[PDB]
Subunit: 282 residues, 6 copies
């Protein structure tokens, strides 16, 4: 009788197709007013010729509330305008799902600076711009009220961002950057009550269905998840997983003496990677 | 006979601190070091570091390339090949900080940090990858290549006031992991060091200070050596007393939906009992 | 704004030691504390006086937590006089330590009654009230139960067959109540409470936080708060396992199986 | 030559199911089994089990003591010593279930379950402990003694509708751990089995067979298991498992300052449950 | 370009089974293989020596090999085989110690000759060949002032790591080889040689080459032996590597799983029973502490 | 009533150090100890045999002991020593194999005699005594139709478990003893005997007072040996137990730490380098998979 996100306003970037479209539908299904951001052209062209307007129509025909947005998330002024338009027209911006992205796959020796710059701009600068925009608004509200406020940012990383992948020096760097951006935002926004997490999204059941992680995004954006921040959560196909990050698996001390590069080979071999045996040691 | 005899190494941001320690260390082991830095002394600081290297019996040349600029980076690598024969080693260390909470941070503060750290390391990596790959295709065999990038704790874990620096140093991990996969077949390795106001050459080589910025420099030198050709795509922490191998993201808890869609109205209990363990499962 | 502003909390055995610390801590954070204790002109009044002199709200209660009728009345006298009972901290207890061959059935029964029956009675009393409110509103309600176990309850201790059984029973009671009250929104956790490391009130802030709206997602957990350290505990788990191949076990072979496959006191040898 | 030749064993609640399986197994390995139960079959069900045991070549006698009653328990142990010489083994299995959600549960439902399971197991343990300790003091040497108590999954983990049964089966673990420590010096062992209407003696391999753990109970009662005490052993279906108990999985220090409840939320999230990230900590 | 082009390898007991597979594999990747074996062929034709038959198989497949009939337990014969390799083939780069026999019986039925003979072929043979090349390699390193090329791969087995009923001799021998391997790794490290141990687990392997994958094929570990002997594996030494059937595994050895201190007072044997039970094996509980 | 009252124990190499400590400890707990040693004393008085001196110390402390001068590497002498134990003392319940020698040298400087001799005393000696009592215990079990009492404690060392420069012979020997111990445990289990291995790590131990603690005392592990030889340890067999200085530790052995499947296709040595790096040693990253 009561949806998870009733009364909330959510921005979903790149929500015209695929994963982002699934997010927009899921958030709207749970009662949120969804700002459907996308720049693409509708294949049919009938209407406004804009794919974001098609997603809004789907949301409204299912009983949900949504408006379209055509902001370039890589552009500072346009992001400010999108956030200003949310507060003035919808009262507040409660949820940001940074999903907008592009790929320019090629081995680095065939990759141009435009291929690199553009992928870094849409993924990292875009997520940084929207995060800063809502952070300023949320912190201003918290300082005025003297209490915590509501805030949800869900960023989007990927397997290549966590592990690298051939042909994706730009895309892997961008999706890795988003993990560090997420961890830092979590620490910076903790005291005012907002959470910042990262999703790794990748009757009938298709393990490749792009919307299979969308209920997790919707739940993370809900009041039930106010205690979860700075986490990387993988929701691909059949499985939901919590990931944890970098950790030492082998450690050795120099005894408070400088390392000797002519001895590090044997130390790396025996004490770090285990490719040589140590022998008896007292 | 030094570990790096005959090798040519580029160290970006080698005028002070950690990079200065690297440049000294590589030159000590026989490499000809290209000391890259843009800073001035109290007189260019890269020239001063070259002089220190030479006074200790080493070989070095200065370079003043902006590592964020594509043409200058490509030109510096061409110069290394034309004047010194080859560029075998790249230590990407140049960086800046513009620390503030995100609500006080300008886009320039963000862009500038991302450019020097990530674009710079990507630019030098592409430049040598192209040279190394061309040599490998012409000879039909593997060639020598070493790239050591620089990440940091904030890049691995985040840190208040460092949305830009943390994003940059995290990106470098993904760049390092990917470059390792791309350069494997021609024989080059790509690793990342996590190294953490007196310059290193001004410290007595006998005393041990846990805050010494050059304590990881021998690790960088060894990774650049012919002994480390089997190590690539690794993140290695060398700070103070300890040398550590790190491994990355992994699942610590996992649950299946039984090949039915997740229900957001049910995920609260599942997150509590099966993921984070804040609620008990009971007998199952 | 206190953590527990507007909340009403009952603390059993709040006249001395750990329980008094809990009562003081909850009242400091805005809760109205029902100070329950039977000791001596009555120690529960003395604790109420301390709470009010510090600016808090407290009332005395002299119910025997082992008695069903008195427990049902105390909860009613909380709902009727104070509006609601949001928090129950089950801390009342006694000890009668002796080796089992020297222990009387009364030493056993009385300890089991105060610790286990007392915590069960108060839990049933608020569960019934809380569940009724959920049925009327059709939504989740507020509820906190914090039970008290101890190291002897988790690991055993010489001379404490009664006390160890009682504190162990409270763990299972806590795990089960968490499952039963999950749907209506109440949580049930267990504290193990044991700058001075021997301070009996060192775990009291942990109880206070568990009783707060910030801890609504934590239930069925055992939390150790002793001295310098705060620890989350997890329970029984297999450390060695062997299969019989879907054939019955043979007691004349279990010795070798226990040694090689369970406890590791004998080697297995090469096994294909 | 049976494992339990010359031994006398008491099994409480041995008229049906798990307890009947234990009674059969102990007698199969040579023990004289005291088959205790209060139930009816025609005749008393404990007599029926004695007849089954004897028909298989074993030795057994029936007993109708209410194990929740102190005087009857003391009499049963006295009867064992006077008629059979000694009581070497006690398998505490008698129990009942009164499953209900707590709000529908009566005090009698709670009291009766606690009485039969915990008080009964405590009463028989105290009775034999007194006898065994008296024999050890007279001879100045260690004596033979085995107590096997019965817990269950609900006792270790809880289960909806079983506040009484879960409390009882949890209590038995602490009773077992404590009795092991108290009886160690005289040489007796105390362990706990977790064993999980077709009777066992009329039954191939069925994972739901109530007697599948009975051989484990028999071995624990044998001279081969004198070095094992205070253990919880799970024997369900195909698997035999050794369990270990409560342990810290996350720990944090207050720096020798009092905890602050207004700061504990952030500490619980980052240092205990891991719902928030810690960030870099040098 | 083969992995082992230009290398010379000695494989002991290479006339049949696992060792024959090693000899075939090393030759396939470019090594000149010294096929050592004492056994005779079934036909008796030619020289009657099975090692010559393996050489013929190697050569018809385009490889290089020579036969050797040295008793690896004999000091003088082993020293001669290594000298022959240096004088006729230039150098000895690789030694695969595989020769062995079994004399299975429970110890109470076993003669000392059965014990001695198994220890002699397995352990003394591996020690003798290792010493002979170690002397050559160290002399070459002193002459050149540089590291030299060197590979020793010994052969252990499951019985050597865990024991097996009826194999006191074979288990002792294959365990000794692990300690021998660990020590040789430490002794030869400075000149650059590596020493590892393979745990590899009728129809000869060359008659099964194009055959369908069989998990019981004894030659499935030979590519692992070939790679360990290659220039690519110069950073791996003192390791025990199991290559059986479908799986390739790295093993690690002895380690403490339980530890207790006496508080700098002597142990009391009348108190060790409870300590063993509660603090070492965990058969008794500790209680609250 | 001592732990070992009524038991008869043989300790080989019990004239000095660790073996002497074992002999003293077993006798202190009630055992009649056969003090075996070949060495001479400093005085040369009377028999001039150091084993006779240890017997005197044991008897002067109120214990029971007899001397023995058997060469444990010699089959005839070992079988006779076990016969003498049965005929003169009734039975041999406990064998502590401690006799050994060291001939440390890098392998290239080591003679075959240095290798053979160390292998003979350590491994052949321990195999010989074990076989002798196994025959006695097994015959006694067949006659009685019941299990019998039997304890064998062998001696390994850190070099046997991990290798050590200059000890190819000693490391192989002490490693062989682990496999010997694991196997004997399996072979003697059914008749009730246990076989374990101790890793124990100039003033003789009896020249120290029973109340001082020296972390270098060679007798610090002797109470552990006595407990393993006692009726309380009948459920422990095939174990390796380290008792050095302050610590008592249970060790466990070889196990896989990394594993990879070939997909039921033969390994390719030209692909194993990348597999070793990414899937076994972790020296290269795998990337997204």
């Amino acid at each position: 009788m009561t949806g998870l996100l009733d009364g909330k306003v959510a921005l979903v970037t790149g929500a015209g197709h695929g994963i982002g479209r699934g997010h927009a539908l899921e958030l709207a299904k749970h009662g949120a007013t969804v700002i459907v951001n996308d720049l693409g052209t509708s294949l049919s062209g009938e209407g406004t010729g804009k794919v974001a307007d098609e997603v809004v129509t789907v949301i409204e025909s299912r009983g949900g509330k949504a408006v379209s947005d055509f902001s370039d998330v890589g552009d500072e002024e346009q992001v400010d305008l999108a956030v200003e338009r949310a507060y003035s027209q919808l009262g507040r911006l409660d949820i940001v799902v940074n999903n907008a992205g592009i790929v320019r796959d090629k081995a680095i020796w065939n990759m141009t600076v435009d291929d690199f710059d553009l992928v870094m701009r849409v993924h990292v600068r875009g997520s940084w711009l929207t995060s800063r925009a809502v952070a300023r608004k949320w912190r201003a509200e918290s300082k005025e009220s003297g209490a915590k406020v509501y805030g949800r940012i869900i960023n989007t990383t990927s397997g290549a961002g966590l592990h690298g992948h051939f042909g994706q020096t730009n895309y892997s760097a961008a999706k890795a950057a988003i993990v560090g951006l997420t961890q830092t935002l979590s620490l910076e926004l903790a005291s005012i009550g907002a959470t910042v997490n990262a999703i790794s999204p990748g009757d009938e059941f298709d393990p490749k269905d792009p919307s299979l992680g969308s209920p997790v995004v919707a739940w993370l954006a809900s009041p039930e998840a106010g205690h979860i921040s700075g986490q990387v959560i993988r929701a691909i196909g059949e499985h939901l997983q919590l990931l944890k990050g970098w950790h030492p698996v082998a450690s050795v001390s120099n005894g408070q003496k400088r390392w000797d590069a002519n001895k590090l080979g044997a130390i790396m071999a025996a004490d770090i990677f285990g490719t040589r045996n140590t022998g008896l040691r007292l």
